[PDB]
Design an enzyme around this catalytic site. Structure first.
Site, PDB file in Angstrom:
ATOM      1  N   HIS A  62       0.989  -1.104   0.025  1.00 36.38           N
ATOM      2  CA  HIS A  62       0.085  -0.190  -0.093  1.00 36.38           C
ATOM      3  C   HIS A  62       0.721   1.065  -0.126  1.00 36.38           C
ATOM      4  O   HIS A  62       0.513   2.312  -0.768  1.00 36.38           O
ATOM      5  CB  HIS A  62      -0.980   0.018   1.368  1.00 36.38           C
ATOM      6  CG  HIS A  62      -1.751  -1.278   1.299  1.00 36.38           C
ATOM      7  ND1 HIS A  62      -2.709  -1.489   0.374  1.00 36.38           N
ATOM      8  CD2 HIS A  62      -1.696  -2.200   2.408  1.00 36.38           C
ATOM      9  CE1 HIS A  62      -3.290  -3.030   0.802  1.00 36.38           C
ATOM     10  NE2 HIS A  62      -2.648  -2.989   2.070  1.00 36.38           N
ATOM     11  N   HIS A  92       4.974   6.772   7.153  1.00 37.62           N
ATOM     12  CA  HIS A  92       4.727   6.495   5.492  1.00 37.62           C
ATOM     13  C   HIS A  92       4.266   7.765   4.787  1.00 37.62           C
ATOM     14  O   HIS A  92       3.862   8.752   5.341  1.00 37.62           O
ATOM     15  CB  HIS A  92       3.798   5.320   5.644  1.00 37.62           C
ATOM     16  CG  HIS A  92       2.378   5.726   6.120  1.00 37.62           C
ATOM     17  ND1 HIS A  92       2.093   5.638   7.397  1.00 37.62           N
ATOM     18  CD2 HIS A  92       1.455   6.445   5.517  1.00 37.62           C
ATOM     19  CE1 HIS A  92       0.916   6.160   7.677  1.00 37.62           C
ATOM     20  NE2 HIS A  92       0.303   6.716   6.246  1.00 37.62           N
ATOM     21  N   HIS A  94       1.591   9.007   1.191  1.00 35.84           N
ATOM     22  CA  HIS A  94       0.817   8.859  -0.010  1.00 35.84           C
ATOM     23  C   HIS A  94       1.114   9.759  -0.970  1.00 35.84           C
ATOM     24  O   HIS A  94       1.517  11.144  -0.635  1.00 35.84           O
ATOM     25  CB  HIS A  94      -0.706   9.399   0.456  1.00 35.84           C
ATOM     26  CG  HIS A  94      -1.090   8.403   1.916  1.00 35.84           C
ATOM     27  ND1 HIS A  94      -1.797   7.231   1.830  1.00 35.84           N
ATOM     28  CD2 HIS A  94      -0.901   8.872   3.490  1.00 35.84           C
ATOM     29  CE1 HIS A  94      -1.975   6.941   3.127  1.00 35.84           C
ATOM     30  NE2 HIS A  94      -1.288   7.564   3.919  1.00 35.84           N
ATOM     31  N   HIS A 117       2.749  10.948   6.856  1.00 35.90           N
ATOM     32  CA  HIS A 117       1.900  10.644   8.080  1.00 35.90           C
ATOM     33  C   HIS A 117       2.961  10.038   8.906  1.00 35.90           C
ATOM     34  O   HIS A 117       3.398   9.097   8.825  1.00 35.90           O
ATOM     35  CB  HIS A 117       0.943   9.795   7.916  1.00 35.90           C
ATOM     36  CG  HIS A 117      -0.243  10.395   6.826  1.00 35.90           C
ATOM     37  ND1 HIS A 117      -1.222   9.681   6.321  1.00 35.90           N
ATOM     38  CD2 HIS A 117      -0.604  11.689   6.878  1.00 35.90           C
ATOM     39  CE1 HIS A 117      -1.812  10.362   5.966  1.00 35.90           C
ATOM     40  NE2 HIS A 117      -1.616  11.595   6.049  1.00 35.90           N
ATOM     41  N   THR A 197      -6.653   4.439   5.828  1.00 36.55           N
ATOM     42  CA  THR A 197      -6.766   3.260   5.241  1.00 36.55           C
ATOM     43  C   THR A 197      -7.476   2.253   5.947  1.00 36.55           C
ATOM     44  O   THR A 197      -7.771   2.497   7.340  1.00 36.55           O
ATOM     45  CB  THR A 197      -5.488   2.537   5.210  1.00 36.55           C
ATOM     46  OG1 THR A 197      -4.854   2.563   6.545  1.00 36.55           O
ATOM     47  CG2 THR A 197      -4.382   3.566   4.337  1.00 36.55           C
TER      48      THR A 197
HETATM   49  C1  LIG Z   1      -3.501  -0.309  11.052  1.00 37.48           C
HETATM   50  C2  LIG Z   1      -2.960  -1.057   9.816  1.00 37.48           C
HETATM   51  C3  LIG Z   1      -2.807  -2.151   9.833  1.00 37.48           C
HETATM   52  C4  LIG Z   1      -2.456  -3.057   8.863  1.00 37.48           C
HETATM   53  C5  LIG Z   1      -2.319  -4.361   8.511  1.00 37.48           C
HETATM   54  N1  LIG Z   1      -1.961  -2.318   7.598  1.00 37.48           N
HETATM   55  C6  LIG Z   1      -2.239  -0.827   7.280  1.00 37.48           C
HETATM   56  S1  LIG Z   1      -1.705  -0.171   6.433  1.00 37.48           S
HETATM   57  C7  LIG Z   1      -1.751   1.657   6.756  1.00 37.48           C
HETATM   58  C8  LIG Z   1      -0.999   1.813   8.026  1.00 37.48           C
HETATM   59  O1  LIG Z   1       0.130   1.317   8.360  1.00 37.48           O
HETATM   60  C9  LIG Z   1      -1.533   2.977   8.624  1.00 37.48           C
HETATM   61  C10 LIG Z   1      -1.292   2.978  10.299  1.00 37.48           C
HETATM   62  C11 LIG Z   1      -1.820   4.008  11.088  1.00 37.48           C
HETATM   63  C12 LIG Z   1      -2.057   5.190  10.341  1.00 37.48           C
HETATM   64 CL1  LIG Z   1      -2.840   6.289  11.485  1.00 37.48          CL
HETATM   65  C13 LIG Z   1      -2.299   5.239   9.211  1.00 37.48           C
HETATM   66  S2  LIG Z   1      -3.096   6.779   8.253  1.00 37.48           S
HETATM   67  N2  LIG Z   1      -2.854   6.692   6.810  1.00 37.48           N
HETATM   68  O2  LIG Z   1      -4.345   7.149   8.871  1.00 37.48           O
HETATM   69  O3  LIG Z   1      -1.856   7.868   8.984  1.00 37.48           O
HETATM   70  C14 LIG Z   1      -1.895   4.435   8.336  1.00 37.48           C
HETATM   71  N3  LIG Z   1      -2.909  -0.467   8.814  1.00 37.48           N
HETATM   72 ZN   LIG Z   2      -1.316   7.574   5.942  1.00 37.61          ZN
END
Ligand SMILES: Cc1cc(C)nc(SCC(=O)c2ccc(Cl)c(S(N)(=O)=O)c2)n1
Ligand SMILES: [Zn+2]
EC number: 4.2.1.1
Length: 258
Positions: A62, A92, A94, A117, A197
């Site tokens: 992703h 990470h 986007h 992020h 996500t």
């Molecule tokens: C929770 C989770 C579990 C698994 C199996 N994969 C992902 S992929 C995206 C990611 O790691 C993620 C993790 C936490 C945050 Cl807060 C965000 S985001 N895009 O909202 O910052 C993205 N996320």
């Molecule tokens: Zn993110």
């Protein structure tokens, strides 16, 4: 048929496996800068990354995550709109297929090239998996990227990418200092939202900096060389891994400035 960013499994389908996708505090959002309220009661953000231990970089199919050892009190976010202390677990990005898109948050509808992020979990809940089941579980610091001069503190990330081209590849990644990814100013907007996500859990206090960082065209081009597919499968470039803006519904975005 799991989720992703394509026509048949992208954002517009996520609601079937994750019905909260149509919930009351989903992210990202458009930040209408004229409608955001200045809150003089908001505190300066405290970003304390002096002891951050990065460990490893992972391509998950992703995006990619730069991971930190979060087993001790190092690399914390606090202040701002936060109560208590949040510990950095990973960052990470986007990004787009083109420089005119790639951010998840937008600012008066402007889309940036990419968005970083930095994900932190609330120490009161002991670990990230328990924190995501709480409304104040996570604090994500979001930083926009525009294409211009290179960000020198980003180059180490860029240079390891060729070692993690495909889904499930990881590389050792120590001593990476995330302070080199931060704008001079820590002026921010903040609002209550969700993971962008799946599983789209409504557990995040978002803190979006107003000042973007600049990265070069050659740095973002190297993000677009990653692949969503695993090794030995047909190549699908990892681009346009962003969720569009979601309805604001009953929420107020607050500004730490002006
Ligand atoms: C929770 C989770 C579990 C698994 C199996 N994969 C992902 S992929 C995206 C990611 O790691 C993620 C993790 C936490 C945050 Cl807060 C965000 S985001 N895009 O909202 O910052 C993205 N996320
Ligand atoms: Zn993110």
């Amino acid at each position: 048929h799991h989720w992703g960013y394509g026509k048949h499994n992208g954002p517009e389908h996520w609601h079937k496996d994750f019905p909260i996708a149509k919930g009351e505090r989903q992210s990202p959002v458009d930040i209408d800068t004229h409608t955001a309220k200045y809150d003089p009661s908001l505190k300066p953000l405290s970003v304390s990354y002096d002891q951050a231990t990065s460990l490893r970089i992972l391509n998950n199919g992703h995006a990619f995550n730069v991971e930190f050892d979060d087993s001790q009190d190092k690399a914390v976010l606090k202040g701002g709109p936060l109560d208590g202390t949040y510990r950095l677990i990973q960052f990470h990005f986007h990004w787009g297929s083109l420089d005119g898109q790639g951010s998840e948050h937008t600012v008066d509808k402007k889309k940036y090239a990419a968005e970083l992020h930095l994900v932190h979990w609330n120490t009161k809940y002991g670990d990230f998996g328990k924190a995501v089941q709480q409304p104040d579980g996570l604090a994500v610091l979001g930083i926009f990227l525009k294409v211009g001069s290179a960000k020198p503190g980003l180059q180490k990330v860029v240079d390891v990418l060729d070692s993690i081209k495909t889904k499930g590849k990881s590389a050792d990644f120590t001593n990476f200092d995330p302070r080199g990814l931060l704008p001079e100013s820590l002026d921010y907007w903040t609002y209550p939202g969700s993971l962008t996500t799946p599983p789209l859990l409504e557990c995040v206090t978002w803190i979006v900096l107003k000042e973007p960082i600049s990265v070069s065209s050659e740095q973002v081009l190297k993000f677009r060389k990653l692949n969503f597919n695993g090794e030995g499968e047909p190549e699908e470039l990892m681009v346009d891994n962003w969720r569009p803006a979601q309805p604001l519904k009953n929420r107020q975005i607050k500004a730490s400035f002006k």
